[PDB]
Design a binder for this molecule. Structure first.
Ligand SMILES: [Zn+2]
Ligand SMILES: [Zn+2]
Lengths: 370, 550
């Protein structure tokens, strides 16, 4: 209704005026299939500028850090009705954030059906399940004998709604979900996606075997990028389109501006001598008329000896100089970059002409003396 | 010569009623209002000076009733007194309104009131009491430090606002944005005043952290105008972060490019390369946002005009300068061309980025003939895992000056057995979206005309009617542009050029089209450095003489 005579009742069924002067309400407030204790005193007038409100400890825990929110709301909400609206909205938020605590699943379907469906798959495939039985992660084999993983996130009702599917390979995964579709259906789809990008993987395999792949290390299956160094102190980044892998890639060159020219020129000349029947390397060796080195240095390949903020060497005569007092990070920085980083963070604390504060990468104590 | 007082006497009452609203604008909204309408106030005042200039003082009562109070309100208001020449003008107004020999005491009273107002502007102590005492005692008059003073005030804010940045989530004095807001209203009146640049600079770099904007676009539009008229000249970092946070300024710089190429400087492509490079646009365009938005206003012009050659030329200049500002600043960490032009093959772009200066004049046929073959696959085999459509694969080809234009001049050089690849390519350029039936017909009409033209080139210097026969339809621009190519390439040209030009220039449209053609041809040659001095001097002469005819 308009008035909070009927709108209140219709929107807060379980809040009973104890008192005749409708000043004390008590009982329950509803939120997300779950009803909770509430004890809401008014003064002699119908004014929330002064009002008492206590919870059960079950609710106060669930309005963890909205306490000040709701005090503000009480002083600046006009009506009791609108205040309840705001409160229910505010619960919905709390629970939707902390969705990790608040399942009762419907066991009769849920836990049994999951065993049924995983049985239908076969017991080799599953690798991880979290004990909330939310996340399950599964394993699939290529024709090429390469492992690819799939995360499923499951909802309260798996068989009703789509599982959320998270997977590695680089084109956007598509799963036709019906309420009739199940794990085997999404499994089949996943195998289809494997066999489809099969060529892209054979190409990336070939590169990572025959050559000094540098900038991804233990590269995922995600990556389209392969910064090859070749001879020494010169490198080419190669980004390949997955559907047409064998096709010419966009490729471009880092190193000495004198050494980059003739290669950049000969590419221009020989680009029409690309062919998609031979491999990327078997086109590149005869296009650029060179060989590559087969891991020219495999230990000190390259340490990005760069700022770790700006990712550049030589910021205004500053070198990556400033480092971490840590064996596991060792990440250089610049004075300027690291000062403008740590001074912005809340964690860091400033002595006279020194900043003690957390290394960006590893969050360990790092000191900067200007 | 029609009105005299009427439009001016109306806008007077508009403005006089509005100055009484604003009145020294010591609030937020008095200021926003002043902030906007000021420009029109300035023009009003130019018209007002002309009106006061022509006549003399104390004698006329045209708006002499309240002009005192209009210029009072104007003056005591400082948001006005910061705008371009408003202050010099209001002075010019008053210079008319004085009398040398006041006779009735009213004129003398006005003159006194004007000395009062001038002193109020020029030499008044409406600033901090302590500093006045100190300096007067020290033996300065305001003038001689006002400057350093100012610069100091600024560098306090400048530096201070820079600090507000560095404290990205620190338990410190968050300089309350209401001050930030404040200044930004103060910078618009005086974007043109040299001794504030730094301030500006440090507002347009240190956005920080708020969900929301905190400046007003009266400021973002003020900045825009003094950039593209080049009356502030900021550092490049400043203006990229400006585009990047008020998108309608970026649209609105691109319009300010279009009007250059459309209205003022039709086909002066050196002045257009000048304007692209002295705009920081190529630069801003390193940023995958800004270029995506640029290309889309470029796309909406490519459609409303169904492929203006002059709009195409300005794209070829934009790409040109984009590539080689992209190239420059991008050794580590640049965004992969499937990010800039995402609607087509990365392969094809990676070919077409390779500039022809740095290729032999002999290996241009190879290159072109390969480009066309892959285009044929991307358009005609429009399958899954390709472009959306042809349009996008053509839009790729446009951006690349050199390649699109060189097909024709290479067809003439291979007129003996024309390659089908180039025929198809060229008919694709001058007509995309045809049906393969239409493209076959276009190729073979051109092949017939290649026979006729090769016969005519290997003959002596002949008439122009023989050429206008083959010219005599929906493939007209194909044939005309190819035939102009013929005239400038063959040594039989430079003789019967005029005969063909005068016939083909039915309208002004055709003339303007061919002017753009020639300027493009010559910018292309001078760039790649490639010349027969015959064709150079000829093209220059014809361009010169045709720009009078129009
Ligand atoms: Zn750095
Ligand atoms: Zn560290």
């Amino acid at each position: 209704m308009a008035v909070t005579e009927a709108s209140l009742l219709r929107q807060c069924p379980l809040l009973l005026p104890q008192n005749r002067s409708k000043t004390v309400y008590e009982g329950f407030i509803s939120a997300q299939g779950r009803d909770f204790h509430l004890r809401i005193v008014l003064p002699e007038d119908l004014q929330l500028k002064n009002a008492r409100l206590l919870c059960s400890w079950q609710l106060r825990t669930i309005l963890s850090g909205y306490h000040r929110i709701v005090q503000q709301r009480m002083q600046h909400s006009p009506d009791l009705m609108s205040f309840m609206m705001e409160l229910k909205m505010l619960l919905e938020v709390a629970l939707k954030n902390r969705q990790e605590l608040y399942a009762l699943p419907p066991p009769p379907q849920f836990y049994s059906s999951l065993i049924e469906e995983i049985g239908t798959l076969g017991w080799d495939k599953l690798v991880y399940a979290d004990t909330c039985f939310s996340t399950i992660k599964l394993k699939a084999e290529d024709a090429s004998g390469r492992e690819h993983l799939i995360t499923l996130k499951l909802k309260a009702k798996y068989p009703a709604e789509s599982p959320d599917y998270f997977v590695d390979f680089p084109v956007p995964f598509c799963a036709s979900w019906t309420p009739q579709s199940s794990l085997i259906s999404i499994y089949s789809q996943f195998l289809a996606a494997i066999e489809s990008l099969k060529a892209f993987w054979d190409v990336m395999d070939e590169i990572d075997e025959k050559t000094w792949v540098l900038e991804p290390e233990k590269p995922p299956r995600s990556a389209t990028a392969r910064r090859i160094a070749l001879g020494n102190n010169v490198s080419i980044n190669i980004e390949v389109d997955p559907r047409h892998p064998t096709m010419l890639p966009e490729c471009f060159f880092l190193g000495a501006d004198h050494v980059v020219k003739p290669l950049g020129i000969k590419l221009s000349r020989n680009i029409h001598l690309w062919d998609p029947e031979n491999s990327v390397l078997q086109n590149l060796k005869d296009v650029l008329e060179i060989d590559f080195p087969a891991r020219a240095i495999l230990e000190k390949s390259d340490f990005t000896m760069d700022c770790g903020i700006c990712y550049a060497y030589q910021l205004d005569g500053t070198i990556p100089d400033q480092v971490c007092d840590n064996s596991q990070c060792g990440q250089p920085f610049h004075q300027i970059c690291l000062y403008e980083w740590l001074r912005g963070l809340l964690t860091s604390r400033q002595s006279f002409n020194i900043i003690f504060g957390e290394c960006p990468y590893c969050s360990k104590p790092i000191t900067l003396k200007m | 010569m029609a009105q005299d007082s009427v439009d001016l006497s109306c806008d007077y009452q508009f403005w006089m009623q509005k100055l009484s609203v604003w009145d020294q604008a010591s609030t937020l909204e008095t200021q926003q209002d002043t902030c906007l309408h000021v420009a029109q106030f300035q023009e009003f005042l130019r018209k007002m000076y002309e009106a006061l200039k022509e006549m003399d003082s104390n004698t006329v009562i045209e708006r002499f009733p309240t002009i005192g109070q209009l210029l009072a309100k104007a003056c005591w208001n400082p948001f006005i007194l910061a705008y371009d020449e408003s202050q010099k003008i209001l002075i010019w107004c008053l210079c008319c309104l004085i009398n040398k020999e006041p006779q009735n005491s009213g004129q003398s009273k006005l003159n006194s009131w004007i000395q009062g107002v001038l002193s109020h502007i020029l030499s008044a102590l409406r600033f901090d009491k302590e500093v006045a005492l100190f300096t007067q005692g020290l033996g300065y008059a305001p003038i001689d430090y006002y400057p350093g003073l100012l610069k100091n005030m600024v560098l306090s804010l400048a530096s201070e606002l820079r600090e507000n940045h560095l404290n990205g989530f620190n338990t410190q004095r968050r300089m309350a944005p209401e001050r930030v807001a404040s200044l930004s209203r103060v910078c618009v009146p005086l974007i043109t005043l040299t001794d504030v640049d730094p301030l500006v600079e440090a507002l347009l770099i240190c956005h920080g952290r708020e969900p929301q904007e905190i400046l007003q676009p009266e400021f973002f539009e003020a900045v825009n105008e003094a950039i593209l008229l080049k009356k502030i000249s900021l550092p490049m970092s400043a203006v990229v972060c400006l585009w990047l946070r008020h998108l309608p300024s970026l649209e609105k710089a691109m319009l300010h490019l279009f009007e250059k190429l459309i209205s003022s400087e039709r086909n002066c492509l050196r002045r257009i390369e000048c304007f692209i490079k002295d705009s920081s646009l190529p630069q801003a365009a390193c940023h995958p946002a800004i270029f995506r938005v640029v290309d889309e206003m470029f796309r909406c012009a490519l459609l409303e005009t169904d492929g203006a050659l002059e709009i195409i030329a300005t794209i070829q200049v934009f790409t040109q300068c984009f590539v080689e500002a992209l190239e420059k600043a991008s050794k580590q960490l640049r965004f992969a061309l499937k990010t800039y032009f995402p609607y087509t093959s990365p392969s094809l772009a990676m070919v077409l980025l390779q500039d022809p200066q740095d290729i032999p004049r002999g290996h241009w046929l190879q290159t072109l003939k390969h480009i066309s073959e892959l285009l044929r696959e991307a358009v005609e085999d429009q399958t899954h895992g390709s472009c959306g459509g042809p349009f996008e694969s053509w839009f790729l080809f446009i951006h690349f000056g050199g390649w699109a234009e060189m097909v024709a001049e290479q067809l003439l050089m291979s007129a003996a057995e024309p390659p089908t690849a180039l025929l198809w390519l060229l008919a694709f350029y001058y007509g995309p979206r045809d049906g393969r039936q239409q493209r076959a017909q276009t190729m073979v009409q051109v092949k017939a005309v290649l026979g006729h033209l090769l016969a005519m080139s290997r003959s002596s210097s002949l008439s122009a009617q023989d050429l206008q026969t083959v010219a005599g339809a929906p493939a007209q621009q194909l044939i005309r542009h190819l035939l102009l190519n013929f005239l400038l390439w063959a040594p039989g040209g430079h003789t019967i050029a005029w005969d063909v030009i005068t016939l083909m220039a039915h309208t002004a449209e055709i003339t303007h089209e061919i002017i753009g053609f020639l300027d493009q041809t010559l910018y292309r040659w001078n760039r790649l450095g490639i010349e027969s001095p015959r064709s150079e001097k000829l093209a220059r002469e014809l361009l010169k003489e045709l720009r009078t005819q129009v």
